[PDB]
Amino acid sequence: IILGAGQVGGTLAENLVGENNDITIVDNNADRLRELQDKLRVVNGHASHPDVLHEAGAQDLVAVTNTDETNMAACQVAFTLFNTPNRVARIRSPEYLAEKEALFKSGAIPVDHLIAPEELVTSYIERLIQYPGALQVVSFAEQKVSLVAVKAYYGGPLVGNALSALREHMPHIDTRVAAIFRQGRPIRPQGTTIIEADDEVFFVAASNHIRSVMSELQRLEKPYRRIMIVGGGNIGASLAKRLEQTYSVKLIERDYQRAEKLSEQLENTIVFCGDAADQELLTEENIDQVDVFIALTNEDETNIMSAMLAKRMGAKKVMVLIQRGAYVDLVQGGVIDVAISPQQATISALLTHVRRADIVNVSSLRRGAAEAIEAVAHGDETTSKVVGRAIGDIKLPPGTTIGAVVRGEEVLIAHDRTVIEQDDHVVMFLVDKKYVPDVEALFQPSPF
Amino acid sequence: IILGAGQVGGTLAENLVGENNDITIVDNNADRLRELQDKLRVVNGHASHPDVLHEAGAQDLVAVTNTDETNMAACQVAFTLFNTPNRVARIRSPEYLAEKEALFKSGAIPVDHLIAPEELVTSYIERLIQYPGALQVVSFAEQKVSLVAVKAYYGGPLVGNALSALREHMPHIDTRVAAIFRQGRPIRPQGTTIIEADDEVFFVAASNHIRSVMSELQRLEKPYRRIMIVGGGNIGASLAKRLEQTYSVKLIERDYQRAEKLSEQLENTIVFCGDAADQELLTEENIDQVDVFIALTNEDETNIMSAMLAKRMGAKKVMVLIQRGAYVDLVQGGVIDVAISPQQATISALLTHVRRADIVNVSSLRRGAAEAIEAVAHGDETTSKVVGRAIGDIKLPPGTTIGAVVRGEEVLIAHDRTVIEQDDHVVMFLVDKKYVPDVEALFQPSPF
Amino acid sequence: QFRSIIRIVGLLLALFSVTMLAPALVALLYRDGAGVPFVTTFFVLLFCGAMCWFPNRRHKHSRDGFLIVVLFWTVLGSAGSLPFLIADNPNISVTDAFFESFSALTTTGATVIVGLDELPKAILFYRQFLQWFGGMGIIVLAVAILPVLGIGGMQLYRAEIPGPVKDTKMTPRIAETAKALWYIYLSLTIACAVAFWLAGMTPFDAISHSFSTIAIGGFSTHDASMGYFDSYAINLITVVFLLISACNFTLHFAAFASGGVHPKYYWKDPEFRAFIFIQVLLFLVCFLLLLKHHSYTSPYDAFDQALFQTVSISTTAGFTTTGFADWPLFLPVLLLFSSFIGGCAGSTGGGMKVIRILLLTLQGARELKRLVHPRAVYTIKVGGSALPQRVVDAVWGFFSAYALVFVVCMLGLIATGMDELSAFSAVAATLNNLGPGLGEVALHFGDVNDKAKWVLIVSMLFGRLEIFTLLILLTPTFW
Amino acid sequence: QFRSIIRIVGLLLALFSVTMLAPALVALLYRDGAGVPFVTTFFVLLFCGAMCWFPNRRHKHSRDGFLIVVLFWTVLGSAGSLPFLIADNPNISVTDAFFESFSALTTTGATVIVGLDELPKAILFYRQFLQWFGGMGIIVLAVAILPVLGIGGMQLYRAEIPGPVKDTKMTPRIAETAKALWYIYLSLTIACAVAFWLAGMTPFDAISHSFSTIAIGGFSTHDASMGYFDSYAINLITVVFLLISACNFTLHFAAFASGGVHPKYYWKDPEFRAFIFIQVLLFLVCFLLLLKHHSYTSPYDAFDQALFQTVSISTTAGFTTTGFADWPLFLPVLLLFSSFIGGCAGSTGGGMKVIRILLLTLQGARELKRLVHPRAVYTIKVGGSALPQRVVDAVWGFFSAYALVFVVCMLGLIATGMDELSAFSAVAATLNNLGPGLGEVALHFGDVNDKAKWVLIVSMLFGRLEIFTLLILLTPTFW
Ligand SMILES: Nc1ncnc2c1ncn2[C@@H]1O[C@H](COP(=O)(O)OP(=O)(O)OP(O)(O)=S)[C@@H](O)[C@H]1O
Ligand SMILES: Nc1ncnc2c1ncn2[C@@H]1O[C@H](COP(=O)(O)OP(=O)(O)OP(O)(O)=S)[C@@H](O)[C@H]1O
Ligand SMILES: Nc1ncnc2c1ncn2[C@@H]1O[C@H](COP(=O)(O)OP(=O)(O)OP(O)(O)=S)[C@@H](O)[C@H]1O
Ligand SMILES: Nc1ncnc2c1ncn2[C@@H]1O[C@H](COP(=O)(O)OP(=O)(O)OP(O)(O)=S)[C@@H](O)[C@H]1O
């Protein structure tokens, strides 16, 4: 049961329905709801009133309003009067985190699982800094496997080389190209494909050994030392409170009364008072020695026109925060090295709870029609079409290509000579997402 | 004398100073002013008070505040108490136009020349519709000459062909490639250069015969019939009042009380009530038959995420209105066919008054470092280095290439065999704008 | 409340008596006539009009306004019957008289007197004079007192409509509209009156037919309206003096404001721009159907007969210069339907004035467009600025009330022994203030039953008052 | 655009042929009948239905919806004429047949065949069956496909009805209204059918008169509708099975959603709350006028005759169990006016459904109140929440279009040689979908001229389609 027809509710309502699971979304915004009703059953609803929420739940939880407070009431109304299972409710306002342990580990509020957006993006941004040279890092439902994306340039070890020409050596830890994004549109990896310049080459890597992969491909640049931020809001302060202990941080906030509290809350950080495009402040404070220029503002236009400037002065890298998640590929690449989306990360976390124990887990690498997925193979060779059969012998739908296999806690890179065993978590790249209930029907065990 | 340190005042303050002319700008915004003071003398000023305005004017007019009303007072204070010459003052609010004739042709208000931004952009947008297939149209100080830009694709008559291979025939009316923009960065035209795909090929054309040029290159598509707009503001209504008589207009306004007045003011137009991303409204109202999808809103983010959708459904063409002029090249090309800037058109009109009778007139084709200019050759062969000498024999600074010559009312396309006569208006393309006082010193007559 | 009202009533009864003198003066300047009932009435009314307001000379000041104007016609209409009751020359019954009193004052024009040609020339002036009086009455009311009330039906009437074009000053009302409008009224009556003399007919018929065309009444001193002299001039004068008198008098105020600057004031009013097209298309189609039928030997007569009948029936005038002999049955019916589109608002006219129809045609097509473009925003074009949703409601509730009365008044005439067809032919002729029955040469109002003539009076008021004025009388909220 | 439309057309033509079998089956199960035309039609239509969609099996997806539903009746109605043309047992003209084809399918009930009592029992099943098919047709369209288009006639309808009451599982906009409603349809036809068997009449007349009463119908296997057996039971069943079948079927959806919790769903719907009062007040006044007239000897007959005629004429049913012999002329007229207020919306239905009248009476009285309190704020009470100004406009533009067609369709029947009264008696009977002429002397539709019998077809569509559906076809904006 949802309570949103927004980019969260709409992206879920689109992603989750393969007839595998059934749900009902709620929203007072009719023009958006019956538009989102295409993507199931729609209960028009007013707040968390029991009529809509409570009656829909039993005999016929995700709560994504504008506000957190309304969301908490909805989980309590469903827990008090029906005792409904699960209950994931997004909570944004920081103080509900600052006392989360007191509140939530006392069981008072009924959130079974939290989705704190400010926390998820800020942890994510720190995850890119840790592996220098990584454009995007992809996370699946299984923590063990993950994709790491790099950028191919002129003079790179990976430009123009034949894919299989790199597959002849298996040095130390090994990799595999699961996806190739170029010009904004997706190229599935083939033996015949050549790595041209300015591509998003998505390498596969065991989550434990990611840095090892990038250094074997000679792409692990020097660790970042000097960082620069531009947002004083919820993400800007959280990131500073995480980086001042390990990196030389500088912040730029244009609202004094907020710039003061950032001076109080951050002991070892230098917060400023200026606009992002203040050339004097960027020159006066040594921007030609900046290694990354995270911009975390409200308006996506401001992040770009400032992160484009910092590259021009110029910084070693730049990152923006495109709030709506629909344009991440469009702004990314070229002048701006990295573009981050909270609504392609907030939804990334929601598709790991909903999809739990299911056939497919939708990765964080969803952009346009392409999306990476993780399919689960249940049943022995008698009740499954896809078990025991070697990877090269599976008649996968067009565009789909297996990149790896997760078996328990060990990541096996997909090779044509590999055997899929029972209860595997296969990681693959779909160029076209209209094929899921074909995959969802292929891996799914026949009746038991 | 200016009164702004904004994109208008800053772009002027940068463009106009070649030591050819001297000015003084006024602005209460210190951090922006002494930043804009780099680009001359700065008078810190409060409103149009005579101390700053009036004292600066005599013994030591352009007025670009946030408001029109303040601007009118400044031109009157300078005209009443000193009787200052010229006086160009921007006025945006429509009603000051609606009664302009009553007010201004009565001489009451002292504006010698008006710069009404809403009018200039809306006339400009109609200028692209008139020549289908034109990405951008460039206007110089001389109305007679103008550049027309096109887009080279696979299957185009101009892709891969050698430039000179097109110069062997001079059929009917003739053209010439004055500039080539590709990948956002400028390529000056050479004999060795080849026209690759997705380029901005800037053809030269006499303003009278522009359509004739594009049809001889087989690029004049069918005239537009069905237009769609998305802004209900000052530009949206003005454009509708100009197109409902000749084109089948549809408008989309999301504020009802304003959608009603548009139904009253526009007799033959269909105005709507909806958000730009309302897929139902775009499908319900036959968008797959739209020929151009002008988007004229406040937020540049909204124009893009809607004009990208209309191309996707899809429309035949799309146009946005990127308010700040600094990103016109970045958004343009690719998915969105055309991007318009009012502050690359408001400034385009101001550089035709200021530069009057001067050595250089800065064209409307300013993007990044590249800008097209028009240089005037005064003096007979005895007091000028550049007169009588054939075009191929002028040691022009690097990147500069002559594209045409305007002599009185006749446009002579530049050929290597052409002779520059006295009092000519030469049209050329600078890839790098740091060279102007070299050109400004080359064409300028030696002492008389 | 009622006290100062009876002051107004008895005050008007006195003014009505002063009118009775002018007829009897004719019954002595002429002596083909009987004048005593007019002088007997002049006295009895002056008393009965004075007796009410003398003990009620106490002065005091919307609920006031509705109850006045139903008394302005109820009282004056009853008082109008008195001359006919007294005189033995007509030999007219009471209900026939109350009918002819109301039919005259309401400017209806439906008569119940047979062979009025040879009736005295004194009673023949009083009938036309009462149309003149009710002709003036509607003008002062429609332009001034009535719009304030909220049933103005004049251009963008609703409550606020303070003089429309060239509305300067306007602080004095009724009193600055009763004085100024009279000059147009008198200067229009005389112009036609001497024009009929220049056509050739007697002074009496020249004048007493001017009281009738200008007041859009349709009466006559001859049984046949303008077939008494089938001369193109008289028709072409009666045509042009009905078209001129049918349009908005607030637009006839384009002559008393700094001289003759007419055409701009006239043509820029959408009601007059639709009065012409509706008038032309009517006569145009009523002509082609006569030429294709060879109803008349020479197309000049057909032009004469048609161009008069469409403009004497669709302006609510009610004049008959023919017998529809060679006309298809299907022509009197179409003309009768055109009666609902009466003269332009603010003028002496019929039921659903051009705007009510203009607004109705405008709005009815918008509902046809929205069916394809549901999410579009549409407006009404009539004036400079679109109409408020109050006015669009005030037309569509007026159509509803109209076809609510027209059906109850029909099943009320049916019960009294009439037939379905004659009822329709009667109420559509009385609700619209037309007069002639129309149809395939049908209604003669003498044949009408006694208890139907009452219902007809009940109806002709409903049309003369804007239907709501009397419909709210029986509401619980008003009382 | 047009391509995928013809796919739908040929698909329905095939489905219509599959219907043709059930008649011919009876012309062989029964011993009185002619089956060759039905089986001749079954083949030729299956071909002509298949020939269109085979080269058009290309699938593709508002302007689409209006043009479908005028083809849904134009195509199926023409196809319905074929059996009558072929069979020589009722040798009958083409236009008489197209009329009887449309009159049947459009659920009108206006017949042009004299002495159908002894006609074969095979053509007698096909006429009643076509009413059943058009009975189902209106239900699937009125409640499902038609509301989305923009003309609702369904409680609050403009284009936004989830049914309001139990708005659940509405995903399939038409695929679960055709499936679920059929059970109500079949469970209603059988109940009355066996009830007529318990009344005593033959299986054929028992069943083929259920096809006629459950749908709005009006047809019969006897010249006189239900005077064939003047038994109170048959009337009292036909009365209750018209009242039950006339109202909103989404209120009959109070039985298929968790069993029989009827009374709350029914009575809390204001349309049903006004369907009863309008039905009671009619019969109540139609009863006191019969008792005061001593039209019938015993008030049980008067009760029987009245309570059936008001509920067979105001529901658009069209059943005549009398000749209005002792009835005042003034009763058939009043009943014909009551035809406009047909069955509750979303059901086999009349010209202006109860809401259209209910909304009309509500809004018309608000316009009477505002006249006294101009500065007050008023709203409409009908549902839970007051109506959007879109719907109030969509009622008042519907009245205008109605009385625009009804007048053009009238001056179109007059020209073809009919008389004013008979035209009115005809179009008011066809626009509302009521077969009887309804006068003291009836209109018998054989006497109607050939060209008029076309205008009547043109008209009965206008009523069956919500008038706008076909009125926008001739707009410039649609094309
Ligand atoms: N009282 C309310 N009850 C329920 N939903 C509400 C209420 N007020 C606002 N909303 C929701 O507000 C949402 C639109 O705003 P938001 O979702 O907050 O914007 P957004 O969060 O940036 O978009 P998202 O994150 O993709 S849902 C819709 O889901 C509405 O249902
Ligand atoms: N043009 C700008 N340049 C620099 N900083 C800015 C600019 N505009 C806004 N900011 C800062 O960003 C803040 C906006 O933060 P809030 O709206 O309160 O929370 P938030 O930052 O929007 O939430 P998120 O996580 O950043 S989307 C402002 O208060 C300033 O601190
Ligand atoms: N009282 C004032 N006196 C002088 N300048 C003022 C005053 N108030 C605002 N400004 C000007 O406001 C400007 C910043 O806002 P705007 O220029 O209106 O924004 P903008 O117009 O979109 O930018 P432009 O068009 O490139 S100047 C500066 O030029 C300030 O000098
Ligand atoms: N998301 C949107 N979709 C569609 N129309 C919008 C949207 N946002 C704003 N508008 C319209 O654009 C208007 C903004 O106009 P104003 O700010 O009053 O003047 P203006 O349009 O900004 O001036 P210009 O010339 O367009 S920059 C709003 O009032 C709406 O009419």
Short mmCIF file of all heavy atoms in Angstrom, two decimals, chain B residues 246-274:
data_model
loop_
_atom_site.label_atom_id
_atom_site.label_comp_id
_atom_site.label_asym_id
_atom_site.label_seq_id
_atom_site.Cartn_x
_atom_site.Cartn_y
_atom_site.Cartn_z
N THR B 246 -2.03 33.85 -38.44
CA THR B 246 -1.38 33.12 -39.53
C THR B 246 -1.14 31.64 -39.26
O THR B 246 -1.03 30.88 -40.22
CB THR B 246 -0.04 33.78 -39.88
OG1 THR B 246 -0.14 35.19 -39.71
CG2 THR B 246 0.34 33.48 -41.33
N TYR B 247 -1.09 31.21 -38.00
CA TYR B 247 -0.78 29.82 -37.67
C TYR B 247 -1.81 29.28 -36.69
O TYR B 247 -2.42 30.04 -35.93
CB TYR B 247 0.62 29.68 -37.04
CG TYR B 247 1.78 30.12 -37.91
CD1 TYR B 247 2.16 31.45 -37.96
CD2 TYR B 247 2.53 29.21 -38.63
CE1 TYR B 247 3.23 31.87 -38.74
CE2 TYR B 247 3.61 29.63 -39.41
CZ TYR B 247 3.96 30.96 -39.46
OH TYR B 247 5.02 31.37 -40.22
N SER B 248 -1.99 27.96 -36.69
CA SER B 248 -2.92 27.31 -35.77
C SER B 248 -2.25 27.16 -34.42
O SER B 248 -1.41 26.28 -34.22
CB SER B 248 -3.37 25.96 -36.32
OG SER B 248 -4.11 25.25 -35.34
N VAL B 249 -2.61 28.03 -33.48
CA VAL B 249 -1.94 28.14 -32.19
C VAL B 249 -2.69 27.32 -31.16
O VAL B 249 -3.92 27.18 -31.21
CB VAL B 249 -1.82 29.62 -31.76
CG1 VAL B 249 -1.05 29.77 -30.43
CG2 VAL B 249 -1.16 30.45 -32.85
N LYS B 250 -1.94 26.77 -30.22
CA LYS B 250 -2.47 26.23 -28.99
C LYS B 250 -1.55 26.67 -27.86
O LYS B 250 -0.33 26.69 -28.02
CB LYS B 250 -2.56 24.69 -29.01
CG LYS B 250 -3.31 24.11 -30.18
CD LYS B 250 -3.35 22.59 -30.08
CE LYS B 250 -4.62 22.03 -30.67
NZ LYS B 250 -5.02 20.77 -29.98
N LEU B 251 -2.15 27.03 -26.73
CA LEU B 251 -1.40 27.52 -25.59
C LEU B 251 -1.70 26.65 -24.38
O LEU B 251 -2.77 26.04 -24.28
CB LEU B 251 -1.76 28.99 -25.32
CG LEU B 251 -0.82 29.91 -24.56
CD1 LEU B 251 -1.06 31.35 -24.99
CD2 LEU B 251 -1.03 29.77 -23.05
N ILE B 252 -0.78 26.63 -23.42
CA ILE B 252 -0.96 25.84 -22.21
C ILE B 252 -0.54 26.71 -21.05
O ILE B 252 0.65 27.03 -20.90
CB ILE B 252 -0.15 24.52 -22.22
CG1 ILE B 252 -0.64 23.60 -23.33
CG2 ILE B 252 -0.29 23.81 -20.89
CD1 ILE B 252 0.08 22.28 -23.36
N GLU B 253 -1.50 27.09 -20.22
CA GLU B 253 -1.28 27.95 -19.06
C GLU B 253 -1.82 27.24 -17.83
O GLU B 253 -2.95 26.75 -17.84
CB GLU B 253 -2.00 29.28 -19.29
CG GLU B 253 -2.43 30.03 -18.06
CD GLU B 253 -1.27 30.41 -17.21
OE1 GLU B 253 -0.80 29.58 -16.41
OE2 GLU B 253 -0.78 31.55 -17.35
N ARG B 254 -1.03 27.21 -16.75
CA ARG B 254 -1.40 26.45 -15.56
C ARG B 254 -2.02 27.32 -14.47
O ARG B 254 -2.33 26.80 -13.39
CB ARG B 254 -0.20 25.71 -14.99
CG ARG B 254 0.60 26.56 -14.00
CD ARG B 254 1.94 25.97 -13.63
NE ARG B 254 2.78 26.96 -12.98
CZ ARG B 254 2.81 27.18 -11.67
NH1 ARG B 254 2.06 26.45 -10.85
NH2 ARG B 254 3.61 28.11 -11.17
N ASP B 255 -2.25 28.60 -14.72
CA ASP B 255 -2.90 29.48 -13.75
C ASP B 255 -4.23 29.92 -14.36
O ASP B 255 -4.24 30.68 -15.33
CB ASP B 255 -2.01 30.67 -13.40
CG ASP B 255 -2.66 31.62 -12.41
OD1 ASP B 255 -3.50 32.46 -12.81
OD2 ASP B 255 -2.34 31.53 -11.21
N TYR B 256 -5.33 29.44 -13.77
CA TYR B 256 -6.65 29.67 -14.35
C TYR B 256 -6.95 31.14 -14.56
O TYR B 256 -7.31 31.56 -15.67
CB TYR B 256 -7.73 29.04 -13.46
CG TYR B 256 -9.12 29.03 -14.10
CD1 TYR B 256 -9.67 27.88 -14.62
CD2 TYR B 256 -9.86 30.20 -14.18
CE1 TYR B 256 -10.94 27.90 -15.21
CE2 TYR B 256 -11.11 30.23 -14.76
CZ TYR B 256 -11.65 29.08 -15.27
OH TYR B 256 -12.90 29.11 -15.85
N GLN B 257 -6.84 31.94 -13.50
CA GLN B 257 -7.22 33.35 -13.59
C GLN B 257 -6.45 34.07 -14.70
O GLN B 257 -6.95 35.04 -15.27
CB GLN B 257 -7.07 34.01 -12.23
CG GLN B 257 -7.83 33.21 -11.17
CD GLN B 257 -8.37 34.05 -10.04
OE1 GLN B 257 -7.84 35.11 -9.74
NE2 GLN B 257 -9.46 33.59 -9.43
N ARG B 258 -5.23 33.60 -15.01
CA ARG B 258 -4.53 34.11 -16.17
C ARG B 258 -4.97 33.40 -17.45
O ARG B 258 -4.95 34.01 -18.53
CB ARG B 258 -3.01 33.98 -15.99
CG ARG B 258 -2.20 35.04 -16.74
CD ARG B 258 -2.70 36.46 -16.54
NE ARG B 258 -2.99 36.78 -15.15
CZ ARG B 258 -3.48 37.94 -14.75
NH1 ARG B 258 -3.73 38.90 -15.63
NH2 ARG B 258 -3.71 38.16 -13.46
N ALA B 259 -5.37 32.13 -17.36
CA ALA B 259 -5.87 31.44 -18.54
C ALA B 259 -7.16 32.06 -19.06
O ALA B 259 -7.44 31.99 -20.26
CB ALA B 259 -6.08 29.95 -18.23
N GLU B 260 -7.95 32.67 -18.17
CA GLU B 260 -9.18 33.32 -18.61
C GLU B 260 -8.90 34.58 -19.43
O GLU B 260 -9.49 34.78 -20.50
CB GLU B 260 -10.07 33.64 -17.41
CG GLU B 260 -11.51 33.91 -17.81
CD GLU B 260 -12.46 33.83 -16.65
OE1 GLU B 260 -12.04 33.35 -15.58
OE2 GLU B 260 -13.63 34.24 -16.80
N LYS B 261 -8.02 35.46 -18.94
CA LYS B 261 -7.72 36.69 -19.67
C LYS B 261 -7.11 36.38 -21.03
O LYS B 261 -7.36 37.11 -22.00
CB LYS B 261 -6.81 37.63 -18.87
CG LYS B 261 -7.14 37.76 -17.40
CD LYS B 261 -8.05 38.97 -17.21
CE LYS B 261 -8.42 39.19 -15.76
NZ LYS B 261 -9.03 40.53 -15.55
N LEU B 262 -6.32 35.32 -21.12
CA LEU B 262 -5.82 34.90 -22.42
C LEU B 262 -6.96 34.45 -23.33
O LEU B 262 -6.87 34.61 -24.55
CB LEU B 262 -4.78 33.78 -22.25
CG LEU B 262 -3.49 34.20 -21.55
CD1 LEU B 262 -2.42 33.13 -21.70
CD2 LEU B 262 -3.00 35.54 -22.09
N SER B 263 -8.04 33.93 -22.76
CA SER B 263 -9.20 33.63 -23.60
C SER B 263 -9.89 34.90 -24.05
O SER B 263 -10.47 34.93 -25.14
CB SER B 263 -10.19 32.73 -22.85
OG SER B 263 -9.98 31.36 -23.13
N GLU B 264 -9.83 35.97 -23.25
CA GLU B 264 -10.44 37.23 -23.66
C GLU B 264 -9.56 37.97 -24.67
O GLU B 264 -10.04 38.42 -25.71
CB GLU B 264 -10.72 38.10 -22.43
CG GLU B 264 -10.98 39.58 -22.72
CD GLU B 264 -11.99 39.79 -23.83
OE1 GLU B 264 -13.09 39.21 -23.76
OE2 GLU B 264 -11.68 40.54 -24.78
N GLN B 265 -8.25 38.08 -24.38
CA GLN B 265 -7.36 38.86 -25.24
C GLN B 265 -7.11 38.20 -26.59
O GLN B 265 -6.85 38.90 -27.58
CB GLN B 265 -6.02 39.12 -24.55
CG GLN B 265 -6.09 39.78 -23.19
CD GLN B 265 -4.72 40.15 -22.68
OE1 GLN B 265 -3.70 39.80 -23.29
NE2 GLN B 265 -4.67 40.86 -21.56
N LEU B 266 -7.18 36.87 -26.66
CA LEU B 266 -6.89 36.14 -27.89
C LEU B 266 -8.20 35.62 -28.46
O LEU B 266 -8.84 34.73 -27.88
CB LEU B 266 -5.91 34.99 -27.63
CG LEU B 266 -4.77 35.25 -26.64
CD1 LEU B 266 -4.04 33.96 -26.29
CD2 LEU B 266 -3.80 36.31 -27.15
N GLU B 267 -8.60 36.17 -29.61
CA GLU B 267 -9.87 35.81 -30.22
C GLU B 267 -9.82 34.45 -30.90
O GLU B 267 -10.72 33.62 -30.72
CB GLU B 267 -10.29 36.88 -31.23
CG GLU B 267 -11.08 38.05 -30.64
CD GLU B 267 -12.54 38.03 -31.04
OE1 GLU B 267 -13.04 36.98 -31.49
OE2 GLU B 267 -13.20 39.09 -30.93
N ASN B 268 -8.76 34.18 -31.67
CA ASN B 268 -8.69 33.01 -32.53
C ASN B 268 -7.70 31.97 -32.02
O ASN B 268 -7.21 31.16 -32.81
CB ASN B 268 -8.35 33.44 -33.96
CG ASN B 268 -8.90 32.48 -35.00
OD1 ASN B 268 -8.21 31.56 -35.45
ND2 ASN B 268 -10.16 32.69 -35.38
N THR B 269 -7.41 31.96 -30.72
CA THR B 269 -6.44 31.05 -30.13
C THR B 269 -7.15 30.13 -29.14
O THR B 269 -8.20 30.49 -28.58
CB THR B 269 -5.31 31.80 -29.40
OG1 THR B 269 -4.76 32.79 -30.27
CG2 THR B 269 -4.18 30.86 -28.99
N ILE B 270 -6.59 28.94 -28.93
CA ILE B 270 -7.10 28.01 -27.93
C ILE B 270 -6.09 28.00 -26.80
O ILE B 270 -4.98 27.47 -26.95
CB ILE B 270 -7.32 26.60 -28.50
CG1 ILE B 270 -8.17 26.66 -29.76
CG2 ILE B 270 -8.05 25.76 -27.47
CD1 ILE B 270 -8.74 25.32 -30.19
N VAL B 271 -6.49 28.56 -25.67
CA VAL B 271 -5.68 28.55 -24.46
C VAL B 271 -6.23 27.46 -23.57
O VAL B 271 -7.42 27.13 -23.61
CB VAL B 271 -5.70 29.94 -23.77
CG1 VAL B 271 -7.13 30.44 -23.63
CG2 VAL B 271 -4.99 29.92 -22.41
N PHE B 272 -5.36 26.87 -22.75
CA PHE B 272 -5.73 25.71 -21.97
C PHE B 272 -5.44 26.00 -20.50
O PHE B 272 -4.98 27.08 -20.13
CB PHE B 272 -4.97 24.46 -22.42
CG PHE B 272 -5.39 23.93 -23.77
CD1 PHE B 272 -5.08 24.61 -24.93
CD2 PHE B 272 -6.13 22.77 -23.86
CE1 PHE B 272 -5.47 24.11 -26.16
CE2 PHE B 272 -6.53 22.28 -25.09
CZ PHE B 272 -6.20 22.96 -26.24
N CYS B 273 -5.69 24.99 -19.68
CA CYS B 273 -5.31 25.00 -18.27
C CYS B 273 -4.66 23.66 -17.97
O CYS B 273 -5.35 22.64 -17.88
CB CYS B 273 -6.50 25.26 -17.36
SG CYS B 273 -6.12 24.99 -15.62
N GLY B 274 -3.34 23.65 -17.86
CA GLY B 274 -2.63 22.43 -17.56
C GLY B 274 -1.17 22.69 -17.30
O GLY B 274 -0.63 23.75 -17.64
#
